[PDB]
Paper text:
The 650-Å-diameter head is formed of a near-complete T = 7 icosahedral capsid and houses the genomic DNA. It is made up of 415 and 420 copies of two capsomer proteins, the major capsid protein gp49 and the capsid decoration protein gp48, respectively. Within the capsid of the extended phage, internal density shows layers of packaged DNA.
Author numbering:
A (entry chain H): 94 to 288
B (entry chain G): 45 to 192
C (entry chain H): 2 to 44
D (entry chain I), E (entry chain M): 3 to 127
F (entry chain G): 242 to 288
G (entry chain N): 3 to 64
């Protein structure tokens, strides 16, 4: 209402713009990445926890990581970008970095991973309801081949328009932001990892 | 003031639900986030000594009382500031267990627990940049923080 | 004369705001290195 | 905000008007299918389904209470202008007879030769 | 004027519409009070009071018939999507029991875990 | 998430003295201070 | 005050303690009189009258 815009000085349009931007970006992340997480992986792509061993350091995911890289070169997937829930960041870093000596076993740094990403969830409470985009499940990861089997279709980026006010109630313009977008994913660009 | 007032701020909420062509759009909302409230208390202490005690007890004098005030003062300072930390009924989230529990370690292996803490303080964003502990474990906490 | 008498009259007492970090996290576009974008209004 | 320095109580500024309510979304059951731009009584909502929807799908009904054109009448009953009009879900057709049928609107144009009628959609009573 | 310099005749132009009728002003009785953005049956008008009020005070009820979000429901009863709902003023809550309660809408979104429902407001029959 | 408030750090004063009892001045030292602290900064380690 | 442009609501901050209470102030009845610095039971108060009190006159107990 126009009263709410006028008297409530802290309130303005900029808060609505900021929230529109935040929700917009969060849904971009959701539509682009949720195919990866939700996809029913088959046995060919899944890689069990090869770093089981017995009493290995929690950088033993390194082992589980390295096999996955082999599992991409076999079948020529050649994964290059890693994705994993931020909870497993440090261990992944300890795998990606020069993980320290262990019983004299100078495990070398894993290479050909140019970038790692951490898609945790994103929750927002609107009114009396809560809407949340699931993040990467903890204890899971994804090796990804970039830009070949993944294609983003951008018809309309983001269009915010002021709409039907109602002078009979002194209510300001309804603001509506809408988008025309889509994404195309593939099973031939992913290898799943546990831990 | 005796009590310091809280801050306030506003945020909005919207979701961008999937829009069927015939769909009627669902509106957003706003909410207010209010800061915390802090208050300042008063502490005081004193003495009540007869002049006879001052006159005859040659050992007695005011400077002993001044030293006692200084000791009680700094003790109260550190206690009031830190006792919230010690006395807090921590929930399961903040309790990192003893990850040196791997059998037959060296007691610099409390290092492992510290690493777990450095993990748990980075899983959650609350990265802890300083440590506190009883001096009884000063050796191992040094060895953990050094090249064990 | 107690200070508690003037406790309720917050107007008389000086007001100071407890400075603190309030806000919400900024969201970021993580997907972009993975996906290759094609932009066309006519899709 | 996760990992904020200090706790801060969230005060929800409650509002009621979730949406203008011109159109209502619904989900079709195992015995319900919808063609675009037709009248279907789904979940007690009577309106113009705007999407082709098979069983188990998600379809949007329009309940704007504007004027609507339709042809799904029972031909035997003579629809005169102004007569109340109900929906018989057993036969899935409009009808002037009340019986247990659900009241849906009021007819503006009588039954022409082609059994077409124009009415106005009454609220969801 | 009053001291008109010339005799003249004044002709009126009658028109009945005065306002869109989306919001109704009401005056609170003794046993009535209103909170911002909450549902109240005041003087036979059911709607979302947009201003806080007290005895003998004047407030505004929104009766737009749009979709509204609320949870003031008898939680024992299940508010599935599409079911009619009645305001029980004795308990001051939404129910599905009818009896003498006031029919005040139809539910669009069923009862979730938090007993929150989205419903369209019927036009006060 | 830790803040120290210091209104009056420390003041010591000498006061009442019942001369009828030959008692020296009462000495009182006092402070006005407050501490704000939270669980959003700490992790409890064992050993 | 009287010539106030605006109506003003007065905020009366209370304080129960009014005086130290060492000397209770009393009124001499008809059949009672007091001398300087002497013990008297005036109006249920026992204390050292410190003014020569005539009937209906004023004194200061302790």
């Amino acid at each position: 209402t126009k009263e709410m815009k006028d008297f409530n000085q802290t309130f303005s349009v900029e808060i609505l713009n900021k929230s529109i931007g935040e929700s917009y970006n969060a849904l971009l992340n959701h539509i682009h990445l949720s195919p990866i997480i939700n996809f029913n992986y088959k046995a060919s792509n899944k890689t069990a926890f090869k770093g089981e061993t017995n009493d290995p350091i929690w950088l033993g995911i390194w082992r589980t990581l390295t096999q996955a890289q082999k599992d991409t070169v076999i079948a020529k997937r050649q994964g290059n970008i890693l994705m994993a829930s931020s909870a497993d960041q440090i261990e992944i870093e300890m795998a990606l970095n020069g993980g320290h000596l262990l019983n004299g076993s100078m495990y070398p740094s894993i290479k050909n991973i140019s970038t790692v990403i951490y898609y945790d969830g994103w929750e927002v409470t609107v009114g009396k309801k809560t809407y949340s985009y699931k993040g990467v499940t903890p204890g899971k990861g994804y090796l990804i081949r970039p830009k070949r089997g993944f294609k983003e279709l951008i018809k309309r980026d983001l269009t915010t328009e002021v709409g039907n006010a109602d002078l009979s109630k002194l209510v300001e313009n309804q603001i509506v932001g809408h988008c025309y977008r889509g994404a195309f994913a593939a099973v031939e660009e992913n290898v799943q990892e546990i831990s | 003031p005796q009590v310091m007032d809280a801050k306030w701020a506003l945020q909005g909420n919207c979701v961008f639900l999937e829009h069927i062509e015939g769909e009627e759009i669902k509106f957003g909302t706003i909410n207010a986030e209010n800061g915390p409230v802090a208050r300042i208390q008063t502490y005081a202490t004193g003495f009540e000594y007869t002049k006879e005690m001052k006159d005859f007890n040659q050992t007695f004098s005011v400077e002993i009382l001044n030293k006692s005030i200084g000791e009680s003062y700094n003790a109260l300072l550190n206690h009031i500031h830190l006792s919230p930390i010690i006395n807090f009924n921590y929930k399961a989230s903040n309790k990192t267990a003893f990850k040196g529990e791997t059998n037959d370690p060296i007691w610099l292996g409390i290092w492992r627990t510290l690493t777990q803490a450095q993990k748990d303080t980075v899983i959650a964003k609350r990265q802890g940049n300083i440590l506190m502990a009883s001096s009884a474990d000063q050796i191992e906490i040094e060895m953990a923080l050094n090249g064990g | 004369m107690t200070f508690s008498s003037t406790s309720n009259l917050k107007e008389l007492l000086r007001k100071v705001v407890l400075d603190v970090e309030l806000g919400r996290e900024q969201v970021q576009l993580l997907y972009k290195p993975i996906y290759d974008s094609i932009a066309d209004s006519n899709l | 905000f996760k990992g904020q320095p200090t706790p801060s109580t969230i005060t929800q500024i409650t509002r009621a008007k979730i949406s203008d309510g011109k159109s209502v979304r619904v989900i079709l059951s195992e015995g319900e299918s919808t063609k675009t731009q037709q009248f279907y009584l789904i979940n007690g909502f009577f309106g113009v389904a705007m999407q082709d929807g098979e069983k188990g799908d998600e379809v949007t009904l329009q309940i704007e209470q504007a004027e609507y054109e339709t042809d799904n009448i029972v031909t035997s009953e003579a629809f005169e202008a102004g007569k109340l009009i109900y929906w018989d879900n057993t036969a899935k057709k409009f009808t002037t007879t009340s019986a247990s049928n659900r009241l849906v609107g009021r007819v503006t144009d009588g039954k022409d030769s082609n059994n077409v009628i124009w009415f106005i959609l009454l609220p969801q009573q």
